[PDB]
Structure 1
Amino acid sequence: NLRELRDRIGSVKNTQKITEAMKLVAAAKVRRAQEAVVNGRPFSETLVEVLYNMNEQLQTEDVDVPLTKIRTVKKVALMVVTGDRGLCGGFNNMLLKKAESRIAELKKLGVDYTIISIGKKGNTYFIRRPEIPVDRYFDGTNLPTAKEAQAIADDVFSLFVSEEVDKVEMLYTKFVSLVKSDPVIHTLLPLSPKGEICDINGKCVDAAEDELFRLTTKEGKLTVERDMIKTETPAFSPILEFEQDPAQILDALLPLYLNSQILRALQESL
């Protein structure tokens, strides 16, 4: 029937308008996310400047901080930062699929994985499969806040300080390209005292230099380019007086760095 065909065409046209609107909205949200990352730049620029100078002043063998304390890797905690909702390519499938390799890899090593899952599609995954331990189920969130990364941090920091879990590592997708975004797994704890942040494979970037992601148009197309600006650390004042202890001051500092890192891991994933 002709009328039926016309109705089908109308519905398809309506779908095209709706998907186009969704694409535009998603791009705007991504731009907003970029602005959000930039807003927290002063805190991570200032923190790595302090965390550098607190290490270069310290130079002391007797100083050991719990977060950076290294213990035998009998057990590992893996926290999985997945997207909140569906209809986004293979982003969620790819992460969980990549998550499985890490769990599989641990079985070859047999060092007793544990998963902290963030976001709904990660939650609904590890609910329906009970042949895995879960530490906690966290709600996902759009517009992630320091409130919402704190509940992640209060879990992981508390869990890590006790020796049940070691070398807590996090997997999430660093926003590299629009067309592809492969999951990468980093080693959250135990924070390096050099402050260097490195992946499980064994590549560590200096923490002083990190690259924000800025989305710009290359030729006609809409792209993104991750560009890194190194933040130089000015030397600490010669007459500076440490209020507590250098080991003690540093102990307060590490959680701020861990909290800052978890927030970026999740913001980038979002």
Structure 2
Amino acid sequence: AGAKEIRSKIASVQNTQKITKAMEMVAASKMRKSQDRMAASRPYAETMRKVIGHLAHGNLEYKHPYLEDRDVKRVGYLVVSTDRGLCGGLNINLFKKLLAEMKTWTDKGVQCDLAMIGSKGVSFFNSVGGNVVAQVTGMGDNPSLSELIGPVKVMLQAYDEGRLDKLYIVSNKFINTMSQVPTISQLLPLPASDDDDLKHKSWDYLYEPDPKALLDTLLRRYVESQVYQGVVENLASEQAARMVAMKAATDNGGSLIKELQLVYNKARQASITQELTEIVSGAA
């Protein structure tokens, strides 16, 4: 107690409440640009899939770079965590889903390698333990294809050498401002689109080097774009989940400030009754 310090205590909660509000507002502005570059990431990938699916029609069987299925013995996971906290369970719910799915794999006697993206994920798996084969971090609000080439090249190479039989992306898909969903999609072994694969036309490219060589490059270019638009989307989920979870922190602080204001008013009275009472009873 002590009205003296319950004030500074209140004023303190008032301040933090004012900060979390600012964070909410900032994450709000960041939010629109986030969805824009998330949309700009779509053309490159979807166009490339049509080219793959087309030229995959004939050349794929002889040598899949990544088209055919095979016995699973190891599996890879490119995990997309955020470089920054203060965004609710956006990361925890993702990790918790990943962990649960990794368990079903380890129970079948298959190992799980992890490529880590973002500080928060590196920290988490540094604590709970895991086989992180590579990582990239500190991209923040400026993700690039450049920085993803490293970790993806590592996971890809493992698939080429047979040390990986499946490869997943793990990130949050942005449904709407108040709904982000932890998702684990399988990229490579290429899945399985009827849309891009079933139809075909009379014409055909003239590939300079063998089409087999291009089908490989395109396949790798594609997997990287997948991982990038997974990151770039997860980032737009962050800004939302943040500004939302920050409004919560602003309202939590407001409630504490109401409870404190009572505890204060109590001490305020106790203080003034005692000072008055000791003076008058002291005089006697």
TM range (shorter): 0.7 to 0.9
What is the aligned length?
232
Gap change, CA 1:237 and 1:23, over 3 Å in 2: farther
Higher RCO (C-alpha under 8 Å, 6+ residues apart): 2
Inter-CA distance 68–90: structure 2 relative to 1 (3 Å threshold): same
The corresponding residue for 1:244 is 209
Shift of 1:207: 6.5
Q: Which amino acid aligns with 2:214?
A: I
Paired residue type of 1:257 = Y
Give the alignment of 1:251-266 within 5 angstroms.
251-266=216-231
| Farther off after superposition, 247-256 or 258-267 | 247-256
1:12 — aligned with what? 13
- Taking the aligned partners of 1:61 and 1:250, their CA distance within structure 2 comes to 8
Paired position in structure 2 for 1:115:
114
Q: Which residue of 2 aligns with 1:79?
A: 78
Q: Which residue in 2 is equivalent to 1:223?
A: none
- The structure with the largest helix share of the pair is 2
How far the C-alpha of 1:178 sits from its partner, in A, is: 3.3
Residue 211 of structure 1 corresponds to: none
Moved over 6 A (4+): none
**Deviation at residue 264 of structure 1 after TM alignment:** 0.9
SS at match of 1:148: helix
Q: Map 1:49-60 onto structure 2 (within 5 A).
A: 49-55=50-56, 58-59=57-58
- The letter of the residue matching 2:8 is D
> How many Å separate the matches in 1 of 2:43 and 2:135?
31
Q: CA deviation at 1:253?
A: 1.0
**2:28 aligned residue:** 27
Which structure has the bigger radius of gyration? 2
% same residue? 33
Choose 255-264 or 64-73, whichever is displaced more: 64-73
Note closer, same or farther for the CA distance 1:246–1:236 as it changes in structure 2 (3 Å cut).
farther
Taking structure 1 as reference, are residues 254 and 39 closer, same or farther at Cα in structure 2, changes over 3 Å only? Answer: same
Partner SS for 1:63: coil
Q: Deviations over 1:95-136 (max 9, x none)?
A: 221121012111222211222222222111222234x32222
Give 1:47's aligned residue. 48
**Who is 1:188 aligned against?**
187
Taking structure 1 as reference, are residues 237 and 62 closer, same or farther at Cα in structure 2, changes over 3 Å only? closer
TM-score, normalised to structure 1's length? 0.75
Residue type matched to 2:24 in 1?
K
Deviations for 1:205-251, whole angstroms, at most 9, x for unmatched residues? 8569xxxxxxxxxxxxxxxxxxxxxxxx9x87837423223333212
Query: 1: distance between equivalents of 2:95 and 2:39?
Result: 28
The alpha-carbon distance between structure 1 residues 20 and 236, as it changes in their structure 2 partners (threshold 3 A), is farther
Residues 60-209 of structure 1 mapped to structure 2, 5 A cutoff = 62-130=61-129, 132-142=130-140, 143-192=142-191, 196=193, 206=195
Q: Distance in 1 between matches of 2:84 and 2:60?
A: 48
Of Structure 1 and Structure 2, the greater strand share is in 1
Alpha carbons of structure 1 residues 19 and 262: separation in structure 2 relative to 1, 3 Å: same
Distance of 1:3 and 1:189 partners within structure 2: 64
The alpha-carbon distance between structure 1 residues 238 and 107, as it changes in their structure 2 partners (threshold 3 A), is: closer
Alpha-carbon contact 2:42-2:229 (below 8 Å) kept: no
Alpha-carbon distance between aligned partners in 2 of 1:28 and 1:237, rounded to the nearest angstrom: 49
The residue aligned with 2:272 is: none
What is the rounded CA distance, in whole Å, between the counterparts of 1:53 and 1:189 in structure 2? Answer: 17
Find the aligned partners of 1:41 and 1:78 in 2 and give their Cα distance. Answer: 22
Deviations 1:78-99 (A, max 9, x none): 2221122221111121122112
CA distance in 1, matches of 2:147, 2:195: 27
